[PDB]
Amino acid sequence: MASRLLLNNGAKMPILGLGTWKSPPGQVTEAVKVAIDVGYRHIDCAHVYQNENEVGVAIQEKLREQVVKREELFIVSKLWCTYHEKGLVKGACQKTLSDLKLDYLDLYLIHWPTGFKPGKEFFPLDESGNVVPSDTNILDTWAAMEELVDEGLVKAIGISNFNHLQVEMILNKPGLKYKPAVNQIECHPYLTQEKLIQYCQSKGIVVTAYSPLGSPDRPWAKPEDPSLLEDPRIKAIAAKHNKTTAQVLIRFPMQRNLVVIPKSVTPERIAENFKVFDFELSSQDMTTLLSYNRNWRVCALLSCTSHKDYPFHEEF
Numbered sequence: 001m002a003s004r005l006l007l008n009n010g011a012k013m014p015i016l017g018l019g020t021w022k023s024p025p026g027q028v029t030e031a032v033k034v035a036i037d038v039g040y041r042h043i044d045c046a047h048v049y050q051n052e053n054e055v056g057v058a059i060q061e062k063l064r065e066q067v068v069k070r071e072e073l074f075i076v077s078k079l080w081c082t083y084h085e086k087g088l089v090k091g092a093c094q095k096t097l098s099d100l101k102l103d104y105l106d107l108y109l110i111h112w113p114t115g116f117k118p119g120k121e122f123f124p125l126d127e128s129g130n131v132v133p134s135d136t137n138i139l140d141t142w143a144a145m146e147e148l149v150d151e152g153l154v155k156a157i158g159i160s161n162f163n164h165l166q167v168e169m170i171l172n173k174p175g176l177k178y179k180p181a182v183n184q185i186e187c188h189p190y191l192t193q194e195k196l197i198q199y200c201q202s203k204g205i206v207v208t209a210y211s212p213l214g215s216p217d218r219p220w221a222k223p224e225d226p227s228l229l230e231d232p233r234i235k236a237i238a239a240k241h242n243k244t245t246a247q248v249l250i251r252f253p254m255q256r257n258l259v260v261i262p263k264s265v266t267p268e269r270i271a272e273n274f275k276v277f278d279f280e281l282s283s284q285d286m287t288t289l290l291s292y293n294r295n296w297r298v299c300a301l302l303s304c305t306s307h308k309d310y311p312f313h314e315e316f
């Protein structure tokens with residue numbers, strides 16, 4: 001199948017990317033260098049991951065070594081919640097460009113629909129543990145993001161963790177200039193997202209699946225939470241194809257026409273994760289994998305459930 005998907009801005013986005021959340025600063029530079037050597041051309045980053053400078057070192061080294069040209073790379077970053085205010089959006093984007101050492105981003109996403117009080121703290125909490133919200137609304141933040149496209153700082157803009165009603169709010173924004181090109185959401189066999197994906201694709205918005213392997217290294221992961229990598233049913237499907245369960249879990253979203261960004265700092269896994277273009281899951285395999293859905297969401301935070309723009313109270 002095609003290695004890249006067409007965005008509404010006319011650009012092509014590689015369907016397979018390397019995730020960087022939780023990749024240690026002292027290991028992420030080597031991880032990205034190896035990824036590029038192996039063929040990855042799409043890297044997913046975020047200022048909140050606190051490792052963008054190190055990711056940038058890897059990109060610059062490979063550009064300098066002439067292993068790849070800038071136009072061949074698709075770099076993605078995200079605007080954190082404490083910079084939703086109209087006047088802080090550009091500076092937040094410039095800081096990321098500075099750390100990544102690039103003069104433009106291929107895609108810039110609003111990380112979460114929730115705006116937090118501005119400050120040095122990523123999660124400002126009040127005396128009772130509730131996140132302190134800012135009185136900014138998604139529409140004004142979108143307007144500020146559109147300005148980055150007109151100024152040449154980013155080629156395309158998108159959203160992440162937005163439910164269908166929040167996507168609709170943007171699509172119905174008065175004066176809408178640029179439609180969101182991508183909605184990056186959690187997606188794996190235990191959280192299939194059929195409704196939201198169908199909705200987004202029907203609107204011409206590309207969906208990127210994050211935490212495709214269940215994010216086993218998430219910090220809040222608890223000793224006996226479900227494990228996709230060890231699900232016997234998924235292991236059986238992998239065995240039948242002579243592939244690993246990770247390769248099956250990565251191939252799964254690809255056949256649903258989604259972009260997938262698995263994370264790894266391990267050279268062997270980085271290479272194994274890229275060898276998913278040589279096999280195909282049957283329609284039967286796909287429908288079976290979809291039947292494992294349990295609406296089990298791993299990426300959410302209790303401290304944000306009171307925010308007016310919390311995205312997961314809606315069914316989708």
Ligand SMILES: NC(=O)c1ccc[n+]([C@@H]2O[C@H](COP(=O)([O-])OP(=O)(O)OC[C@H]3O[C@@H](n4cnc5c(N)ncnc54)[C@H](OP(=O)(O)O)[C@@H]3O)[C@@H](O)[C@H]2O)c1
Pocket residue numbers: 018019020021022044045111160161184185209210211212213214215216217218229246247261262263264265266269270272273299
């Ligand atoms: N927009 C958002 O709100 C948002 C939220 C969550 C995630 N994301 C993005 O999505 C990316 C991926 O999601 P994620 O980091 O949550 O988790 P993930 O990719 O589902 O899982 C990462 C874990 O799987 C392991 N792994 C990788 N390949 C493996 C393989 N072939 N075999 C066995 N284990 C393997 C990794 O180990 P090693 O690293 O030790 O190899 C790591 O512990 C992120 O890094 C980030 O870029 C975005």
Ligand SMILES: O=C(O)COc1cc(F)ccc1C(=O)NCc1nc2c(F)c(F)cc(F)c2s1
Pocket residue numbers: 021046048049050081112114299300301304305307309310311
């Ligand atoms: O965010 C990432 O890329 C990966 O995750 C994280 C990555 C980091 F570098 C720091 C924290 C998280 C985290 O705690 N993640 C869970 C969230 N859930 C919510 C939530 F439900 C909201 F309504 C608003 C919000 F902002 C968050 S953050």
